[PDB]
Amino acid sequence: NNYDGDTVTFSPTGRLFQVEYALEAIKQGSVTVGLRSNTHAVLVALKRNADELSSYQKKIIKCDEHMGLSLAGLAPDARVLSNYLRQQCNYSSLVFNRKLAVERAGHLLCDKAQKNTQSYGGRPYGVGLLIIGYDKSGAHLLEFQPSGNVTELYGTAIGARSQGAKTYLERTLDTFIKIDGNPDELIKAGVEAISQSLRDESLTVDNLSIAIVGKDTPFTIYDGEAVAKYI
Amino acid sequence: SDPSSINGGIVVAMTGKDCVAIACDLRLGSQSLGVSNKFEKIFHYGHVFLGITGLATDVTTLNEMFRYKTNLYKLKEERAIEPETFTQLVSSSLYERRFGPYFVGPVVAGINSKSGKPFIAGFDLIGCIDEAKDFIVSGTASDQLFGMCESLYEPNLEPEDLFETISQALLNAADRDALSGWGAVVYIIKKDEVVKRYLKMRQD
Amino acid sequence: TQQPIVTGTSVISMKYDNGVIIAADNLGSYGSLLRFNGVERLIPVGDNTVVGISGDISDMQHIERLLKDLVTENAYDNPLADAEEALEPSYIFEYLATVMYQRRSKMNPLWNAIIVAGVQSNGDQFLRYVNLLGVTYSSPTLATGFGAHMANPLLRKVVDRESDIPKTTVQVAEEAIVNAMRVLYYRDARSSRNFSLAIIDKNTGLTFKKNLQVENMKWDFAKDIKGYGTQKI
Amino acid sequence: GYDRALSIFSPDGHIFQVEYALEAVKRGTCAVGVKGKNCVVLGCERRSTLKLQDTRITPSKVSKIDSHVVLSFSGLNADSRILIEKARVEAQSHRLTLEDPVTVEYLTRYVAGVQQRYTQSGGVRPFGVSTLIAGFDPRDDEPKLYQTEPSGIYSSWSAQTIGRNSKTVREFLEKNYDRKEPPATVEECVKLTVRSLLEVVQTGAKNIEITVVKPDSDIVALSSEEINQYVTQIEQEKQE
Amino acid sequence: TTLAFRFQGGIIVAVDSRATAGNWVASQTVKKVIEINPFLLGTMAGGAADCQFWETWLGSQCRLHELREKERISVAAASKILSNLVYQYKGAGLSMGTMICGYTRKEGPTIYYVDSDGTRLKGDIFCVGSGQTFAYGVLDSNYKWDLSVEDALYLGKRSILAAAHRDAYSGGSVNLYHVTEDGWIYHGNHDVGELFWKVKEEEGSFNNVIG
Amino acid sequence: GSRRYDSRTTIFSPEGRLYQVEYALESISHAGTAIGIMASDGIVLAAERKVTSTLLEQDTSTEKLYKLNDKIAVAVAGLTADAEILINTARIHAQNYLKTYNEDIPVEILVRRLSDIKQGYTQHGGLRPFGVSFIYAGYDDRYGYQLYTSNPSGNYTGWKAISVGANTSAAQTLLQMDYKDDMKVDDAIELALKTLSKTTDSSALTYDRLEFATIRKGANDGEVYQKIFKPQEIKDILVKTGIT
Amino acid sequence: XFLXX
Amino acid sequence: XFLXX
Amino acid sequence: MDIILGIRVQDSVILASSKAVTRGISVLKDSDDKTRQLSPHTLMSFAGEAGDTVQFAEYIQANIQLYSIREDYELSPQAVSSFVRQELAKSIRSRRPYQVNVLIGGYDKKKNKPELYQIDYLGTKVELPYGAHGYSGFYTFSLLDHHYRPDMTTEEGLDLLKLCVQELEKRMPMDFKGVIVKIVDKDGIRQVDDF
Amino acid sequence: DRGVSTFSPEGRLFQVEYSLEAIKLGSTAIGIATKEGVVLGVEKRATSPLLESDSIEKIVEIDRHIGCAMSGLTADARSMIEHARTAAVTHNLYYDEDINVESLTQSVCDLALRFGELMSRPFGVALLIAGHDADDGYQLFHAEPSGTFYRYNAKAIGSGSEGAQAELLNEWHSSLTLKEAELLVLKILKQVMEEKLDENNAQLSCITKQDGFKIYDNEKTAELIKELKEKEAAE
Amino acid sequence: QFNPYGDNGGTILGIAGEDFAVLAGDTRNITDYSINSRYEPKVFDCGDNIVMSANGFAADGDALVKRFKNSVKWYHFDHNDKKLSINSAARNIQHLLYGKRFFPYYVHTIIAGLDEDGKGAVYSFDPVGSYEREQCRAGGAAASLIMPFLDNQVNFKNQYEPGTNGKVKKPLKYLSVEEVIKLVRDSFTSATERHIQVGDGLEILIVTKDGVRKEFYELKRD
Ligand SMILES: [Mg+2]
Ligand SMILES: [Mg+2]
Ligand SMILES: [Mg+2]
């Protein structure tokens, strides 16, 4: 009300309204799902279009050969944060000849988002990210929120009607976690998960966006006729 | 490539009875080549006279700089700067360029308008003040001027007598130096009149 | 621009079937003066790497502090700091190799020659060299200073190429290193008798040996050498 | 440094600071530009509430940017000087690098660019100035007349007016100016310019300034008597 | 060795194709003429890297001019962009000797000599490089304004060949260009290996050499 | 942050006016009246001191009339402290020009640069403008005798006779009435005093409440002299014109 | 190094 | 310069 | 760059400047104009380091032309010379100084007098009846000391100048390919085409 | 007042949403992408009949293979074009090749959100960026001040956008010829334009692989306008 | 005074065929009269069918290869995984080298691969970024020995058709991958014999449309 003018102000109940308004931008964003087994980690993203004449907004970005994320909210903010991750992943490779740990990737994003919430003039990031990766400690899935809170999960979903997919994964947890050495079956579980967040619209060939990383699989994105298999 | 002895030139200042004299040669050259026989090295800011020897570009620069500073001084103080005060200003300004100095040998001369005391002073290129009762010398024939002044000079000379002494000191000194001469100028300064005389000297 | 003041001489090393051996004498020379005698020039990083450093000792002590700080920094927000996400010899080397070249590029080098000896997580032997110029190379045998001229020839008679590494045991490999340290004591004027030796095995782990001495030296033949040519007494 | 965003969007999609800068132009004395077949004429109003003025030394309303280009304006007088100075520096800078004087379009584009920069730079307000930039491109005999405004938009005009009661004199020019046949001579172009100002000014004494620009750096400012002859001629023809 | 001279039929530009590192012949297949645009040519003499980098950079600056101004850059403006650039680097050790040759409507055929110590000269004839003197010797003694396009092309070719022969640091092959009101026209790569003997036999010149 | 407390000094009103410049002019309108009158053979500067106290030292005082160089002077109206900042800048600018070109600065060039500084404070920096209006009285070998005025807007204009500060409306009407082009300095002196005498908010105009200065060619042959009038000299000129 | 007609 | 006990 | 001369006579200033531009053992050009018009009644000839000369001349030209537009007024030759000297006086204590020597020939319209200023690269200004830069002076100064009179006409000045060029062509080691002569008077600047 | 980089309770940047309102006031610009080329057309909208319409430059060349049409506060577009042209030429200098139309658009859209308390406010102009490259062929992009860009088969921006976009929805198919596309831009422009469409108050342009980016002459467009009217009367 | 440069010796060789290109380099690394390594590879697969070697000062060589490999990675990120053409790579490397014009990379750079018409391409760079496409280039310590042999055997220089009175030149033709590897092996054995800094091992990288193949051969170790 009187305490939402900028990010530097606390409310009388100890809330940061600008950070909460940035969180609101994610809820308006198109649904995206993350889930992993022990061998592979999968991103499934429902892409959104302006109209039938427009293209479908690309949701998934590659960060390294072994790491990348899906976005929900302000796409330009995702570009800034993904570019930062690319540089940090790259710094780790050139200086230490070392693939950046997915956990450190989270810690670096958390600290970058935080600085924008404590200083005058700046604003919070208006996007949520699902980071997947395969490092020295196996498969990983992270959920980034622009409050700074990063969380490691087995599966999750962010965006509009993400509660449907998040409930499904919470039921399916015991099944999909043990889909080891089977990429196509882990994707199928992810495609069935995002399907619980659909209303009136269904998954089409230029609508669905899938990405996978694993043990003997570099981070690769599937769009167009390559995802026709999973409809 | 010695900045102080490219252009050449000399300044000498003497004190008399209730008067001061400052004199300079008119030569500006480029080593062996004589270029100008009209290059005066004595300037004045109110009743305070400044003679500058050394690198000609710095002589011109410092004249313009001290005109600048004495003009602002007069506007704020609402009075003409005195020789004792101006001497301190020159010293301050030269030392401000301690590690990139003006290649000059300045000489202040004038009569304090309040006390009526004759005043002369000399400086090195980094602004060390050399105050004197008798005389100050500067330029490429400083050795010659020191020898002439030390022998010829006597205290409490009348303005007319003082003129003859300072003139003979400059002329004979300038004739033993290759880079000095080509005409000379003598300022006789009394309390409230100043006479400026151009000397006839050998033009080689 | 530097000049080295207090200096350490040769660091020698070689691979064997199961791991790597590295050795360096305990001397801190001040020009011709053999000033300091208690100087450790082998610095372990975790339980799987040893960094042997020759050249300027002030810059060596700076590199010690960097490696010490690297272990601390790696442990931060790292539950697997003593497991999968522990510091590898390859990580430690590449970091030093980056610093050494960055410093030479700013015309202010760390006046050192460094050999990073260790065993990787997959059991592979790691042995690589870096110096003040940021020049890096790897070989079955690596040595610095006089070691490069005198030790390498002796160590290469044991492991001449890659195929000789599985055929070389830790007993044979250590014997060659200890022999090389004796030859350096004979012929290097800025060497000492006292030295340290470190073995990093993929099975038995890190073995750090201190206060070793050169022994079984041949000096007896000296008594028979009289004059510089014609002298018979 | 002072960083405040003074020029910002409003809910209805307007930048009020830019639109309030136009109100400052609308307050300013009337300025008119009319280009003929072989010339451009810049007419300027001078308000007659100021007597005991010294017209020798008082800043002239029309300013030379180079020997071949001129700039008149309407709005804040102090603001105009900053644009004129920048334009004059850019004029000499162009000659130095391109070894050729600026085109009227290029000089306009630059000035318009400066005005635009102040509409989305922090700590600054827009220029309370609209300019009429007229002249002839090097080795060219085609007349050029351009207009700029605080927003930073610029465009070419056959004839245009800016300042107070500019909508009245624009109404006059719109019916009196023929595109197919512009003023064929200097006299015709000056007369149409004076006529257009006489719709607004008051008296044709020391209230109207006229500047004529011709090809190959041929610029001259008319005196009181020269302008007064046009005023006397128009009024006699009017009584009909 | 590079040269360009102005005549009745426009501008002729001739360059050798040799690059040397000390006394070592590094290459005999180097382009020393950069085609900035259909009406602009740039010659290269000095440091290969300095010329190659800054003249391709000049081509970018000339493209940005015609995008901004909706008009092809003048030979004067183009040459002065390069001369003002190298002048900023004066004393840094840049070693370039170039000639900006082109046609525009306002200028006509124009040649500008631009070197790394900031010298910029408009002129009708220039020879630049280690063998510039050898090229001058033949060019000057045979040059007239009223040369034909055929004779002008040959003289330009023959002047490089003369230098390619005598100058140890010039040779490889001759690259010919003819600049007209319609733009530049390439007149082929001519290997000195075959050209020398062809010229010697047909012309009856080079009597110093064992036939 | 600090946005909350920013007055935004450099913005436009809906009507297209600069709030702070308008309020700075309202401030100046309460300052003691200053008059400049330009004659054919010199310029007069007359200024009324702000309600004087009997125990104010009058002879060693400077409030209104300041010297920029040997050829140019200014009459001040508004905040004196603000004026002295601008005067010291103007004095330096004059010396910079002399140092560069070995010639005394033309009057308009000094006026323009001082006016350009004022303009800067209205467009950028987020600082309040200088609450000062100047009357520039000066001579150069190009235009001869010149009067200018600058105000907080940074706009300057040339004049034959002009008033700044209080009662300019009444003062400008009286000047416009009695001024003519073939006027002498001695006549302009009388006009200046007579105008102040009628427009003054005081009971009677006296020597102790006035600052007076002339810029004549009254020196010996083709050179300009600046005369800042002493208290006794103002007392004499006030009797000579029959005001006291 | 660097090549230098 | 330069004067120098 | 090598030979630049200047002769002030009764009613005009005459500047003579060599046409040769030499680099190494090659005369690249024999028609070079080593001068820029700073204003309608002010001309500046220049000689010194390659590149610096033209870069400096054009920089001054741009500054004087900017002043002329701003004030709608021509600066006096004395004022221009003082500006140029200060730029060189700044330059000499820069990271890389301008190695340029200039003559400024101008006609003061207010005084109705011709004025010749000689300024070296150090910023050393002198007003002279006749001036020269480089080795030229070592011949021309002694020659002009003899033959020069202050009340000479422009035609007498050109004959006096021919006498200088002849002496230089006889005794100077380098071929400077003759001179471009320009006259500055009350009617502005014009070039003598046949010299 | 309030901050410039402030979020609304709905989760949108106030200044970005307000800049979109400014673009709706702007003159209409239409782009249609075909397999034979991409067509760009704009409403000039001269404020007065004395204004020389040919000086209204709302279609602009970025490189030989990329064109650009604008709508909104057109003055703001100058620095966006300047950046786009530099980006296009700079990439050619670094990589000796033409730059991808998408990569160019992304470079322009990076400027968009570089505002706050960088420039003082967002851009008040939308761009239609049309071009061709070897990889993705003929492309049309809509670059907003939000920092977002969509690829379009056809797109209208400005005052008559929603009315024109609904018309483009029906008319567009994948087998449109260049000539068909040219007429379709003129047809839809004439429908949404206030004043009657002619060659002086409307401008056409296109980008083809062969001839690159070309702004049409008033003579060429006038014939296409006459061809358009005849074909509508023919049924 | 500290000298930031050093000579790590060795030599490299790039030959281009019709539908293939080879980049060869000896595996010996030296300083002064000492051998550092008998197998230290300096020919690298940089992705997008581009092989690269920066011979001379190994520290500057490694730094350059590292920066170019990184340049290829960011080219994919910024331009939608577009394949970096050999001609585009060459221009990019010129800017890397000339970027340090006043503190040069003390290396002779050679890249090899296929042009956009699928034909074999070899580009060679000087230390400050001057580059040129060629059929043939030797670089490094033994460049002066190998290069004139390549002129004779690859480009058939000074070779005339027998009995044609030295009038008809030997006609240019593309060499088979078999014939090229023969020339590379004979070039390096010849260079090893007469140059002290060349020997130990030879590593050839062959680039076809199918990908990047490797071949290794022993050289004399004296
Ligand atoms: Mg003498
Ligand atoms: Mg003598
Ligand atoms: Mg050997």
PDB file of N, CA and C in Angstrom, chain F residues 156-181:
ATOM      1  N   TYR F 156      19.547  36.874 -21.545  1.00  0.00           N
ATOM      2  CA  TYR F 156      20.121  38.246 -21.505  1.00  0.00           C
ATOM      3  C   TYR F 156      19.643  39.040 -22.726  1.00  0.00           C
ATOM      4  N   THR F 157      19.485  40.356 -22.548  1.00  0.00           N
ATOM      5  CA  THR F 157      19.043  41.324 -23.589  1.00  0.00           C
ATOM      6  C   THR F 157      19.803  42.645 -23.414  1.00  0.00           C
ATOM      7  N   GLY F 158      20.033  43.366 -24.517  1.00  0.00           N
ATOM      8  CA  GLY F 158      20.703  44.681 -24.541  1.00  0.00           C
ATOM      9  C   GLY F 158      19.706  45.818 -24.390  1.00  0.00           C
ATOM     10  N   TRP F 159      20.122  46.924 -23.761  1.00  0.00           N
ATOM     11  CA  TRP F 159      19.245  48.073 -23.399  1.00  0.00           C
ATOM     12  C   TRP F 159      19.970  49.406 -23.615  1.00  0.00           C
ATOM     13  N   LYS F 160      19.188  50.480 -23.765  1.00  0.00           N
ATOM     14  CA  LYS F 160      19.645  51.896 -23.753  1.00  0.00           C
ATOM     15  C   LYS F 160      19.518  52.437 -22.325  1.00  0.00           C
ATOM     16  N   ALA F 161      18.411  52.100 -21.655  1.00  0.00           N
ATOM     17  CA  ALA F 161      18.166  52.330 -20.213  1.00  0.00           C
ATOM     18  C   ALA F 161      17.270  51.206 -19.680  1.00  0.00           C
ATOM     19  N   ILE F 162      17.599  50.656 -18.508  1.00  0.00           N
ATOM     20  CA  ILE F 162      16.896  49.480 -17.911  1.00  0.00           C
ATOM     21  C   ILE F 162      16.972  49.563 -16.382  1.00  0.00           C
ATOM     22  N   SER F 163      15.978  48.981 -15.706  1.00  0.00           N
ATOM     23  CA  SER F 163      15.898  48.824 -14.230  1.00  0.00           C
ATOM     24  C   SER F 163      15.690  47.344 -13.889  1.00  0.00           C
ATOM     25  N   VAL F 164      16.261  46.888 -12.769  1.00  0.00           N
ATOM     26  CA  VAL F 164      16.054  45.520 -12.202  1.00  0.00           C
ATOM     27  C   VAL F 164      15.743  45.659 -10.708  1.00  0.00           C
ATOM     28  N   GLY F 165      15.145  44.623 -10.116  1.00  0.00           N
ATOM     29  CA  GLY F 165      14.770  44.579  -8.691  1.00  0.00           C
ATOM     30  C   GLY F 165      13.339  45.040  -8.475  1.00  0.00           C
ATOM     31  N   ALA F 166      13.127  45.938  -7.507  1.00  0.00           N
ATOM     32  CA  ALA F 166      11.797  46.421  -7.064  1.00  0.00           C
ATOM     33  C   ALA F 166      11.313  47.556  -7.971  1.00  0.00           C
ATOM     34  N   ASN F 167      10.000  47.599  -8.225  1.00  0.00           N
ATOM     35  CA  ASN F 167       9.287  48.733  -8.873  1.00  0.00           C
ATOM     36  C   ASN F 167       9.867  49.001 -10.268  1.00  0.00           C
ATOM     37  N   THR F 168      10.265  47.948 -10.993  1.00  0.00           N
ATOM     38  CA  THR F 168      10.805  48.040 -12.377  1.00  0.00           C
ATOM     39  C   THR F 168       9.706  48.545 -13.320  1.00  0.00           C
ATOM     40  N   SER F 169       8.456  48.122 -13.099  1.00  0.00           N
ATOM     41  CA  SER F 169       7.260  48.527 -13.886  1.00  0.00           C
ATOM     42  C   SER F 169       7.131  50.055 -13.889  1.00  0.00           C
ATOM     43  N   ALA F 170       7.138  50.669 -12.701  1.00  0.00           N
ATOM     44  CA  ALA F 170       7.047  52.133 -12.492  1.00  0.00           C
ATOM     45  C   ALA F 170       8.325  52.813 -13.003  1.00  0.00           C
ATOM     46  N   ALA F 171       9.492  52.227 -12.709  1.00  0.00           N
ATOM     47  CA  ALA F 171      10.833  52.759 -13.057  1.00  0.00           C
ATOM     48  C   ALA F 171      11.018  52.781 -14.579  1.00  0.00           C
ATOM     49  N   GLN F 172      10.607  51.711 -15.269  1.00  0.00           N
ATOM     50  CA  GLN F 172      10.785  51.548 -16.739  1.00  0.00           C
ATOM     51  C   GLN F 172       9.896  52.554 -17.482  1.00  0.00           C
ATOM     52  N   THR F 173       8.727  52.893 -16.925  1.00  0.00           N
ATOM     53  CA  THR F 173       7.780  53.887 -17.500  1.00  0.00           C
ATOM     54  C   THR F 173       8.416  55.284 -17.449  1.00  0.00           C
ATOM     55  N   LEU F 174       9.042  55.636 -16.320  1.00  0.00           N
ATOM     56  CA  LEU F 174       9.678  56.963 -16.081  1.00  0.00           C
ATOM     57  C   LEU F 174      10.904  57.129 -16.988  1.00  0.00           C
ATOM     58  N   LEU F 175      11.723  56.080 -17.127  1.00  0.00           N
ATOM     59  CA  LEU F 175      12.914  56.064 -18.024  1.00  0.00           C
ATOM     60  C   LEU F 175      12.449  56.234 -19.475  1.00  0.00           C
ATOM     61  N   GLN F 176      11.450  55.449 -19.895  1.00  0.00           N
ATOM     62  CA  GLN F 176      10.868  55.463 -21.267  1.00  0.00           C
ATOM     63  C   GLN F 176      10.337  56.864 -21.596  1.00  0.00           C
ATOM     64  N   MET F 177       9.867  57.599 -20.583  1.00  0.00           N
ATOM     65  CA  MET F 177       9.256  58.948 -20.718  1.00  0.00           C
ATOM     66  C   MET F 177      10.335  59.995 -21.033  1.00  0.00           C
ATOM     67  N   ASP F 178      11.416  60.040 -20.244  1.00  0.00           N
ATOM     68  CA  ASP F 178      12.389  61.169 -20.211  1.00  0.00           C
ATOM     69  C   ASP F 178      13.675  60.846 -20.990  1.00  0.00           C
ATOM     70  N   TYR F 179      13.930  59.578 -21.336  1.00  0.00           N
ATOM     71  CA  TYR F 179      15.160  59.159 -22.063  1.00  0.00           C
ATOM     72  C   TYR F 179      15.068  59.591 -23.532  1.00  0.00           C
ATOM     73  N   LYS F 180      16.201  60.016 -24.101  1.00  0.00           N
ATOM     74  CA  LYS F 180      16.384  60.271 -25.557  1.00  0.00           C
ATOM     75  C   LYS F 180      17.816  59.880 -25.950  1.00  0.00           C
ATOM     76  N   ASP F 181      18.063  59.690 -27.251  1.00  0.00           N
ATOM     77  CA  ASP F 181      19.259  58.991 -27.798  1.00  0.00           C
ATOM     78  C   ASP F 181      20.502  59.889 -27.734  1.00  0.00           C
TER      79      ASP F 181
END
